[PDB]
């Protein structure tokens with residue numbers, strides 16, 4: 014009170030010192046940019062992202078305020094004061110970062126390219142899964158997926174937390190493809206927080222039916238390199254199998270409102286809808302990506318079968334080339350992958366290795 | 369040591385400590401981002417902006433990088449490492465913050481909107497004068513003035529400085545407009561440094577013929593509030609008078625290439641070329657703003673005669689409504705106000721630094 018200048022000067026001096034360093038490859042140091050609507054909303058997501066980003070990296074709770082430009086400054090100021098007070102009340106090492114933008118994409122770009130000083134710049138983007146995508150306008154879903162792809166453009170690592178907001182054995186990990194160390198680094202950082210200390214990492218991977226021993230040995234060596242006391246590596250070959258009849262029926266029902274039946278409908282009408290409504294899922298997309306959808310459905314049913322009784326499932330996030338797949342189908346894949354499981358955490362880190 | 373995590377986490381906890389303090393509104397401090405593309409170019413500008421930001425605020429030497437997205441990140445990181453090494457080589461406490469944008473205005477918007485974290489966020493926009501704007505495409509000058517107007521829109525202070533790139537004692541302060549005190553805060557911070565100890569702040573005012581004592585005591589008490597310790601407080605009544613004809617014709621010659629003499633030329637051609645080049649200066653603009661231009665020229669004359677020798681000249685910055693003046697006319701005003709002087713530092717601030725430092 015009246016002598017905060019000392020704190021400010023100390024912070025500035027330490028930040029300059031930190032910027033003094035020159036080597037970044039050695040330490041990945043996960044810095045998270047959490048894109049939640051407001052810190053008060055989605056408290057569970059905030060706690061879970063804070064768990065693995067606390068004393069091991071900062072977290073910037075971003076907020077893209079959008080509205081009339083005239084009174085934007087006063088609204089943003091009152092919001093910053095209120096949300097910072099709330100966010101310190103529920104002790105969190107998180108910085109509230111509000112910006113003004115005409116839409117979520119622009120504000121996300123502001124936060125993703127400008128937030129932070131020197132070395133304290135976010136390098137992963139954390140999004141809560143858009144649970145209301147079915148009832149939401151599909152333009153906003155397109156914007157959500159385009160935000161994923163913008164993150165992948167700036168060499169960010171995308172984390173998607175799907176968590177049941179209506180609210181002690183193991184922490185399953187479903188490492189499938191390389192990414193980096195991030196997918197395996199999130200469980201390591203989770204385990205050392207004294208809240209998940211009594212939780213045991215039960216890694217999973219896919220492999221050939223004639224190579225369980227060799228794959229297990231190699232993955233155990235990698236885990237020892239990551240030194241996360243892996244309990245066991247349940248190498249599976251069940252991937253790439255027709256899931257079931259009921260599961261495929263459920264997925265078809267999910268995507269039915271957005272499917273485009275070009276063959277059933279007249280070609281001119283199909284083109285008209287595509288031009289005036291480009292997020293419609295064409296049948297060509299389904300035919301091309303039928304194996305990928307089978308992979309998603311099979312992975313979901315495997316998660317239910319093996320990892321039902323797990324606290325935090327960590328899985329690798331499916332991705333597709335920008336524009337190669339309709340946004341509606343992409344969110345359908347994300348819905349199917351994480352359907353009725355415990356708090357699940359889809360991760361795709363950047364190519365550069367964490368350590 | 370070869371480890372940095374100790375510094376990183378300590379800096380974190382300090383930043384969280386800072387953000388936790390309920391500073392209310394009584395924590396104004398000059399936090400400026402120096403929008404200059406190449407920190408190697410214009411070292412004098414960085415040194416000057418560093419003099420009054422050494423230990424009272426941060427300096428985010430922003431930089432917008434233009435090019436293809438593919439290899440944008442690689443060269444951006446290369447430049448970041450290079451320029452941070454350069455800044456550390458010199459004794460500058462500046463964070464080199466680069467962003468990628470299609471145009472300078474968009475990257476500047478990124479920086480001004482989202483740069484910084486917590487309460488160590490930028491507060492003013494230091495802008496090196498766009499010297500050689502005569503030879504530069506006028507789209508560039510349009511963006512340059514739009515930067516001023518964006519900064520004013522987002523409640524930022526704007527300071528533009530016209531250092532000579534080639535690089536008794538007194539610091540002149542022309543407190544002409546009440547902008548919240550930043551014009552007076554910059555000189556105070558300058559003086560309280562090893563270089564400007566022999567400061568001798570000399571303060572000038574603009575007032576009509578009246579009792580000099582009134583304004584004299586007014587600025588005496590104002591500077592006592594600001595702890596300026598003036599060497600002299602002067603009031604000038606020559607402002608807002610017709611300047612010499614030579615300067616007027618010189619100014620008219622400066623804007624001659626960009627002027628739209630629509631009254632002299634045929635109306636259809638004038639309208640067509642106005643539509644082709646919306647930055648052209650119409651004659652109606654000059655007629656409306658003849659008094660403003662005369663003030664801008666008389667002020668340059670006045671500070672040339674009164675303040676020919678002075679290490680720093682800190683003046684209130686001219687402002688115009690968004691779009692009322694063509695960018696060429698605004699830039700011509702700024703160029704005529706600081707035509708041939710020592711380091712001149714035109715300042716304007718959001719009306720919030722009310723004895724708050």
Ligand SMILES: NS(=O)(=O)c1cc(C(=O)O)c(NCc2ccco2)cc1Cl
Nearest residue numbers: 048049050051077078079140141142143
């Ligand atoms: N998780 S989400 O896609 O549904 C989401 C949702 C929101 C959201 O709109 O709450 C958001 N912030 C934008 C905003 C505008 C006004 C207040 O916050 C960000 C995200 Cl990622």
Ligand SMILES: NS(=O)(=O)c1cc(C(=O)O)c(NCc2ccco2)cc1Cl
Nearest residue numbers: 403404405406432434472495496497498
């Ligand atoms: N001080 S300035 O207006 O002349 C200026 C100057 C520059 C600059 O060009 O150095 C700049 N950014 C870098 C850049 C890249 C391409 C065009 O500009 C930004 C600004 Cl504000």
